[PDB]
Amino acid sequence: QPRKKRPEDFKFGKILGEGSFSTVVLARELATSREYAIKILEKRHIIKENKVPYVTRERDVMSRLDHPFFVKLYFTFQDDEKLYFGLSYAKNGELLKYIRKIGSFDETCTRFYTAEIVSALEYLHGKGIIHRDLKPENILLNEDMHIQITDFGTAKVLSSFVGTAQYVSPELLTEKSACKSSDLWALGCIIYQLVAGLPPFRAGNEYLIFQKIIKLEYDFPEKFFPKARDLVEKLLVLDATKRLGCEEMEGYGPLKAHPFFESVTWENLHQQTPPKLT
Numbered sequence: 384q385p386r387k388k389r390p391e392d393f394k395f396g397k398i399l400g401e402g403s404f405s406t407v408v409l410a411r412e413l414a415t416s417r418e419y420a421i422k423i424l425e426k427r428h429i430i431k432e433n434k435v436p437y438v439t440r441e442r443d444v445m446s447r448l449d450h451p452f453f454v455k456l457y458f459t460f461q462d463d464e465k466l467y468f469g470l471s472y473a474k475n476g477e478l479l480k481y482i483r484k485i486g487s488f489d490e491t492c493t494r495f496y497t498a499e500i501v502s503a504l505e506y507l508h509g510k511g512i513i514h515r516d517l518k519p520e521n522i523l524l525n526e527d528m529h530i531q532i533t534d535f536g537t538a539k540v541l542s543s544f545v546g547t548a549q550y551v552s553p554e555l556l557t558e559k560s561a562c563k564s565s566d567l568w569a570l571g572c573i574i575y576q577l578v579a580g581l582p583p584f585r586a587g588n589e590y591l592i593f594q595k596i597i598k599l600e601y602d603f604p605e606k607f608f609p610k611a612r613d614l615v616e617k618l619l620v621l622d623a624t625k626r627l628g629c630e631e632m633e634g635y636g637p638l639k640a641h642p643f644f645e646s647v648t649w650e651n652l653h654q655q656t657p658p659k660l661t
């Protein structure tokens with residue numbers, strides 16, 4: 384093992400973002416010039432808020448992932464007050480940024496990024512890991528414009544937590560259980576948001592959004608790519624055992640074979656040149 388890193392090994396730079404229990408800061412390792420996104424978590428706050436399980440799971444899940452469509456965890460260390468996780472620096476930021484910037488994706492762009500997401504979910508589910516809070520804010524983009532999915536402290540590892548309201552699956556509201564097919568529901572919402580520019584269930588507060596989700600209350604705009612609409616319809620299904628991609632629907636084969644993805648080559652997407660946005 385390389386020796387444990389420590390804060391004095393880095394020149395810390397700008398804050399990349401701030402969350403409830405952590406802050407992500409750009410850092411340059413002095414010995415190498417390499418840049419990392421270092422997530423910094425204060426131990427007292429985690430302990431006080433009973434978040435030890437989530438921080439431990441984040442580290443344990445990330446250390447298991449070895450795939451190009453996920454943020455990598457390179458190292459961890461801690462001082463008296465703080466934990467530090469050394470992550471890949473995804474230089475192009477959140478997918479959410481591009482959706483806002485561009486408005487909505489054309490069909491080529493929608494299909495390519497949707498295929499990367501499906502391919503990442505196939506890998507994650509194959510290891511028995513459910514993300515449980517998938518959304519455009521934690522699907523990051525590297526400097527080559529491939530995805531890197533992050534934000535694993537809320538993940539479930541298969542042998543309590545409700546995600547961002549827009550992407551919450553009806554089973555979490557109707558019987559508090561999560562399964563692989565909950566991530567496929569979020570996938571449906573994300574595909575919808577790429578094409579439409581907005582997520583499918585929106586309202587002025589969380590209670591109202593939850594009410595639309597359990598009623599399957601959303602509509603497609605007139606413009607929506609027909610094969611993408613057909614795919615979203617087969618993912619936003621109330622019954623979690625009937626979503627394309629789930630085990631009871633015979634898994635990722637039938638999803639990857641959906642007509643929306645006809646021209647996709649699945650085997651080497653990360654070596655393909657992404658289509659330019661917009």
Ligand SMILES: CC(C)n1cc(C(=O)c2cncc(N[C@@H]3COC[C@@H]3c3ccc(F)cc3)n2)c2c(N)ncnc21
Pocket residue numbers: 399400401402403405406407420422454470471472473474476477520521523533534535
């Ligand atoms: C875009 C920027 C902020 N950013 C984030 C990166 C992470 O890895 C990461 C890790 N855990 C969660 C998370 N996002 C969570 C989803 O919604 C908000 C919440 C949140 C939570 C804490 C926080 F501090 C910022 C955002 N992101 C990253 C990176 N690796 N490389 C380049 N930039 C990066």
